[model samples]
Target: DVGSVIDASLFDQLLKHRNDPACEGKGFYSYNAFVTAARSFGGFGTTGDTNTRKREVAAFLAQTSHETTGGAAGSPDGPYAWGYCFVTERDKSNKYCDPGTPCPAGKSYYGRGPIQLTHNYNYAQAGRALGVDLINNPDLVARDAVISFKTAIWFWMTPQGNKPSCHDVITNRWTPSAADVAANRTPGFGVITNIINGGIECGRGPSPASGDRIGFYKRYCDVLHLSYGPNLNCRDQRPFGG
Candidate 1:
């Protein structure tokens, strides 16, 4: 039920320009792409209920909003008012390329896709999983919108090494291990953050990034008419493998 329509509509509502020149790179995240991707998100016998579906969508959009947010309190639409204005992060450098993963000559694996799946290793893994050949063609994550969503959903549904998958965490499929318990990683949104980019965004105590994510999540929950579930912050949870 909760798909791109809910979050994409929020983006249109918050962004004053709505694909105007002022909103360059705006509204390129296709709702059709999202639904198409979501159809296969639950593969190999995975299903969801009303709350799980809504919660997962909210969590995904919250992360997407936080990654692409350009709004501020002084903006015309207020804070959290600017979202989906850009599909990729700008001003990026070689910081995201994983030399261990191996890439073609002179290709930087910058952050791309709705969730910004970075690093050459990550691209390779996404390629292997989706048969998209993201290794040599790293830019495909941003070049094609459907490929972008597919890459992101792959990352979301599949576990990252030892870390729990974002899908499992949000859909109550992640059963924490002893190490997870020791790390204070519980079943909540905070745990999801730990999986996404907890190295910097999580295990740092209270953080603005976490705040922004929660801000968008809470707003999206309200907009979708669903209760904001518990464990919405990573202030105390340790980042996966951190």
Candidate 2:
């Protein structure tokens, strides 16, 4: 039998987005959020089972948070700071900012979606996956929050998203340590932070010198209620690979 999962608080937090001003009217962040929406397309709901739903929601939110937050501050730039911080080619000042030509003088940068999809390529791809043209105007990512949320979900559910995802990485059973490097799967929270901010000293990167990757694993474990093992501190967990 499946076990109980997810605390009341975490469930509450996930549902809280329903009323989020940023999520209203987009049909993306309510009872009909991404997973629900996906199932709806197939005439299904969130499985009704609490444990399964909890796992699904946990994975969705955790991965979305990681992608939107950029693993650190001062990475995605202003107006794009929190959640989904998408920027288009119009916004060039920010690093990794795709600069599309024929740029509008004032509104050049406007890729404000959950995954921060930028440029025609991403927009088109997102549109195709979500069965819409997110790139036709590109501003839809920001103009419509629900659309933005859907686009992010689309990206996560894509074939490229098969890298064990947040749930698998956290469980350490789906995509263990060796599989991480072999499959290019993203390691759990701590390792991901280290890779993104290597040598940056944001207090998030991995430390080969002191072997502190475990610290990051611990943080996520506390958040997720997973068991922590010795030598498996946080960094050594290697859930994605091993």
Candidate 3:
């Protein structure tokens, strides 16, 4: 497998309009920060063979692109062309902390970072893992580019319960069990999405969220000159929690 599949130029092209001043995510998603985080994780997407590595990077960026996308149809470019346009969710309808459970420092855990992590539980978990007190410093995700990218990488690399890590799923290392089969939760890009936001996106059947994810994946594969692997969507699978 290759080391550091994404460099400056490749990542720039992979995520179009990301650096545009008009984009809300300008200077938020740092390529340098991303490379450092990936290096710390080491063998992250660089698993199996070269093709496997490429696909993993594509999958990760595909999800990230969709999360931060701005361009929709009829825009200067297609929807896939506008990844990394949002650093944080503009919507603050909810504080995102658990009901009846106040944050120690009155922090809002609403969507931040590339994956748009939500909830107080995730903040605490990420803080403990990254040696930052995210519980008390939730905004660190948006303030520090490295820390923000670190949280996303942390989530991508860590496996939860029976669910395989996003890294493992994309690298083709995740094996499904009888329960997984019964639940229709197979290993693929779709399973990765299920892990990220399956409660709302998966098992709903041909959802726009899942479809956008698939579109990014397909486009990224073409951009990276790789084939769109099997199980690109979570249409047939149930969410891991459900």
Candidate 4:
């Protein structure tokens, strides 16, 4: 069970700011919610060998941490210490709407929940997959604890345009094809970075975003006492879509 791998106590220790009242994400994400949502996604942190499983779990936490981090460099415990610090996107100025998934009246689908789910289509699809009407109630992501974490895990386990799921990338299930190899999209943490936000962050030497992702990943691996495999940055790889 994921509970055995990352219990509440360790979760709290890892995400120092999750419960901190000072954080915008305070009282938003909970260890219990994560475990529950993770369980819904079979094979998560359960497949592969023990080490592989632990590292996979570590990777998931790292990516989610990166998405929700409010930490800044040179702060207490450094930026890596502040994760689960922001639940919703601070800038709700723009609603990320796409064709076919109309932005409902008075609804702004900018970024919310873990992974900060964005775009109208994403909200609609996640709603279909989770049996929730996110298209109409995108606010549910920010308001519902379990659903918020569920959306993050769903994004992690599911694949997107021309890319394998982050789960496959980290669990050694993803095999780079000739095109992928030519693009320098090898398997490892870096590839997972590519899978997520490669369009903007990859192919552009170690940027702060990638740095923070790598930093949090390394920190989580250390917390799990596991070695983070190779290819920790996406600086040299081309985006899957590019």
Measured on C-alpha atoms, candidate 1 has an lDDT of 0.73
RMSD (CA, Å), candidate 1 to true, equals: 2.9
Measured against the true structure, the TM-scores of the candidates, in listed sequence, are 0.87, 0.49, 0.94, 0.97
Q: Candidate 3 lDDT, tens digit per residue, 95-189?
A: 78776545765567889988888899889899889899888888889889888888888889998897889998877678888888998887788
The ten-residue window of minimal lDDT in model 1 covers: 11-20
Better of 1 and 2 by TM-score: 1
What lDDT does each candidate get?
0.73, 0.42, 0.82, 0.86
Off by over 4 Å in 1: 1-20, 43-46
Score candidate 4 by TM-score against the native: 0.97
lDDT of 2 by residue, 1-242 (tens): 11134444544443333333443223333333343344423212144445344444444454344344322334322111233222223345543224553333343334455455655556666767677655455667766556766665555444334234333333343444455555333444443333322234224334442233333234334555544432222333232223
Cα-based lDDT at residue 205, candidate 3: 85
Cα lDDT tens digits, model 4, 1-242, are 87767788788888987777778766778887889888999989898888888888888888888898878967678899888888889899898888777887798898887788999999988998999999899999999899998998898899866789998988888878888989998899998888888888999887889999999998988888997788999999999863
- Candidate 4 residues lying further than 4 Å off, grouped into runs, are none
Local accuracy of candidate 1 as per-residue lDDT tens digits, 173-234? 88898988998898988888778778888877898888888887887677767898788888
Q: Model 4, residue 9: displacement in angstroms?
A: 1.4
